[PDB]
Amino acid sequence: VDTCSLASPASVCRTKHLHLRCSVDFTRRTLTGTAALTVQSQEDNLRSLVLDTKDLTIEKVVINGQEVKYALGERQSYKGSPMEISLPIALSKNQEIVIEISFETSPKSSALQWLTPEQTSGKEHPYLFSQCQAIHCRAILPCQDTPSVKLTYTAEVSVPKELVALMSAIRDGETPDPEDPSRKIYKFIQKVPIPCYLIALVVGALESRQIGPRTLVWSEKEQVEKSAYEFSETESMLKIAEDLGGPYVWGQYDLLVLPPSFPYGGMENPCLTFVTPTLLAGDKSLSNVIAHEISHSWTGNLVTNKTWDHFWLNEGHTVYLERHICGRLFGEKFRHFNALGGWGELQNSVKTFGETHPFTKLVVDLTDIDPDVAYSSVPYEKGFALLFYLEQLLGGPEIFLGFLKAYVEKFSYKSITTDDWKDFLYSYFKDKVDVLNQVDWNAWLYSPGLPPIKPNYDMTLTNACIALSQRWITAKEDDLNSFNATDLKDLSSHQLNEFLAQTLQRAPLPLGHIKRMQEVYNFNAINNSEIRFRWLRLCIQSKWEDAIPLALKMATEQGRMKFTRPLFKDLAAFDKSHDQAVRTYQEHKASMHPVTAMLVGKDLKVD
Numbered sequence: 105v106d107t108c109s110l111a112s113p114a115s116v117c118r119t120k121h122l123h124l125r126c127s128v129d130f131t132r133r134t135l136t137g138t139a140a141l142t143v144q145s146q147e148d149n150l151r152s153l154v155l156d157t158k159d160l161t162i163e164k165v166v167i168n169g170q171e172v173k174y175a176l177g178e179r180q181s182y183k184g185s186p187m188e189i190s191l192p193i194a195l196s197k198n199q200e201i202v203i204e205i206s207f208e209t210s211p212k213s214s215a216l217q218w219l220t221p222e223q224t225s226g227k228e229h230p231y232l233f234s235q236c237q238a239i240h241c242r243a244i245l246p247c248q249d250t251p252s253v254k255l256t257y258t259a260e261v262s263v264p265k266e267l268v269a270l271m272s273a274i275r276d277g278e279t280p281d282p283e284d285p286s287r288k289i290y291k292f293i294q295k296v297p298i299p300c301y302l303i304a305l306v307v308g309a310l311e312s313r314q315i316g317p318r319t320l321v322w323s324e325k326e327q328v329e330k331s332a333y334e335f336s337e338t339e340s341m342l343k344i345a346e347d348l349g350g351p352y353v354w355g356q357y358d359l360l361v362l363p364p365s366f367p368y369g370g371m372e373n374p375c376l377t378f379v380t381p382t383l384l385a386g387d388k389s390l391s392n393v394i395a396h397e398i399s400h401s402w403t404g405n406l407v408t409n410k411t412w413d414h415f416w417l418n419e420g421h422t423v424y425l426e427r428h429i430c431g432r433l434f435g436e437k438f439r440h441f442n443a444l445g446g447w448g449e450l451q452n453s454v455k456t457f458g459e460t461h462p463f464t465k466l467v468v469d470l471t472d473i474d475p476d477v478a479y480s481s482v483p484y485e486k487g488f489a490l491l492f493y494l495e496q497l498l499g500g501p502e503i504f505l506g507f508l509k510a511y512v513e514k515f516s517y518k519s520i521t522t523d524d525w526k527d528f529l530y531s532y533f534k535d536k537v538d539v540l541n542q543v544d545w546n547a548w549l550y551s552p553g554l555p556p557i558k559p560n561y562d563m564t565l566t567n568a569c570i571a572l573s574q575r576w577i578t579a580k581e582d583d584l585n586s587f588n589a590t591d592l593k594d595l596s597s598h599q600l601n602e603f604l605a606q607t608l609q610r611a612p613l614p615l616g617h618i619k620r621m622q623e624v625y626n627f628n629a630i631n632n633s634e635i636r637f638r639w640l641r642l643c644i645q646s647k648w649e650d651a652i653p654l655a656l657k658m659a660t661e662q663g664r665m666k667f668t669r670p671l672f673k674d675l676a677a678f679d680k681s682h683d684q685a686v687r688t689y690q691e692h693k694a695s696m697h698p699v700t701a702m703l704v705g706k707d708l709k710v711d
């Protein structure tokens with residue numbers, strides 16, 4: 105049971121293919137067109153089926169060339185409204201028909217952000233981008249909006265002729281629009297079956313540059329050069345990923361660098377990974393996000409979670425592969441450093457939610473919970489921790505990577521649950537079952553809080569970060585003079601970030617300490633988004649008023665929720681900035697990404 109979807113389940117009927125024919129109307133902020141769903145009955149005598157929708161206007165539903173009866177049910181909050189369709193002829197098991205639905209989206213579609221020209225780099229053209237994960241596809245088109253169903257797709261998208269459309273699919277040409285010469289039609293094919301949350305569309309003034317044998321980077325013109333350099337490791341990471349996961353099946357691996365309001369670090373849309381421009385640090389230091397998106401091409405896109413309760417399957421294995429890629433590139437000591445950092449992020453998450461909170465469980469129960477509200481680092485880092493623990497238990501990385509590859513092969517093109525994974529783990533490691541039986545599965549999978557066992561981590565690269573953080577925390581006023589820019593001499597950006605993460609865990613620090621830190625380290629000058637985020641959080645939590653404008657600026661000039669949400673929350677918790685934070689949210693809300701707007705509003709208790 106997919107408790108996030110109102111559609112007929114996969115046991116009743118299954119969408120095999122979507123052909124989408126649509127037009128992007130920037131004047132009305134609507135996508136209008138037809139979704140032709142090829143649906144296969146899984147039941148005898150099937151006479152109706154139900155699809156998910158959210159804020160969609162339905163013109164008509166056509167089957168066999170005639171209009172048929174349908175009904176939209178009452179809205180169920182974030183789940184949208186179920187659409188029941190009356191089939192004109194009862195279907196036998198395995199019979200396939202095509203259902204063509206004429207529809208239009210709402211300007212407030214939670215799947216979409218529509219940007220005015222001033223919100224773009226070039227300032228002349230508007231821009232549209234989608235983000236379907238987890239349950240926002242239903243806000244673009246009527247569908248069985250559950251990852252338990254996998255479908256291929258084709259699309260034809262009409263857009264103003266000065267603009268470019270791209271999708272999570274292979275580009276299949278472009279022509280002028282016969283119905284409107286001011287327009288172009290872009291065509292796309294996705295021949296590998298995918299869950300619908302992987303459907304993606306961008307439309308804007310896009311340019312491309314080739315950066316590897318199977319990768320173009322796409323962005324507005326003013327970000328092309330910087331992005332090509334930032335992501336130049338992409339082909340080397342793809343090759344490593346193929347070694348660990350098996351054949352890359354998707355053809356192209358292109359990158360799209362979004363405008364700053366893109367709500368996540370990356371989204372693994374097949375053939376076209378979407379990324380935040382906050383990755384553009386200038387030195388490739390945030391490239392683990394690319395490694396992560398690349399890894400989803402196996403873990404998530406090939407082997408997929410059956411429902412969102414099992415999201416950790418997607419994220420945990422992906423983080424596990426991510427960290428192996430970075431380990432191969434930069435060394436095993438670096439894989440351990442990143443692993444240990446992740447455990448720190450997990451500590452933060454558990455502390456934030458509370459150690460007994462149900463969202464700190466690995467396998468969650470999303471009944472009546474908006475997946476956007478449950479989203480956190482828990483499935484990423486608790487999932488990774490479980491896999492890293494099992495790696496250590498079962499004899500090391502070489503051995504566990506053998507399992508990972510077998511797992512991907514076994515479940516490729518399928519949707520699976522935690523029990524399917526666990527079952528295969530036991531099958532694969534049958535000669536080590538006594539070891540597996542020592543695992544507290546009930547705790548790891550189903551209990552809240554930190555895991556019952558902490559893995560072993562090499563400390564080599566972490567030691568200097570902890571040592572320096574501890575010097576600062578234990579410093580008294582008469583110690584402040586001893587700090588100097590030479591303290592940072594031998595620290596990488598990764599280590600500077602970890603030093604701040606360690607210190608942030610003990611925040612607040614005395615205001616004089618934080619002022620001295622700026623005096624000697626000049627963290628205000630660092631534009632690396634990860635570093636700047638943690639530094640500004642440390643400043644605001646330590647009540648430094650000078651930091652207020654910097655934090656407000658970062659919170660609003662980009663919209664990656666990882667940064668914008670905690671920055672707004674910290675600004676709201678500081679009495680001196682509370683009123684400004686609320687005001688600033690209120691002023692920006694109408695032009696924010698709709699999901700970001702919703703969550704920041706909840707965080708601020710505004711509305």
Ligand SMILES: c1ccc(NCc2cccnc2)cc1
Nearest residue numbers: 237238412415475476478479
């Ligand atoms: C993107 C947006 C929301 C979700 N939510 C599903 C989820 C969250 C946390 C734990 N378990 C499952 C997933 C991806």
Ligand SMILES: [Yb+3]
Nearest residue numbers: 115116147150
């Ligand atoms: Yb039934």
Ligand SMILES: [Yb+3]
Nearest residue numbers: 580581582583
């Ligand atoms: Yb002293």
Ligand SMILES: [Zn+2]
Nearest residue numbers: 396400419422
């Ligand atoms: Zn992910």
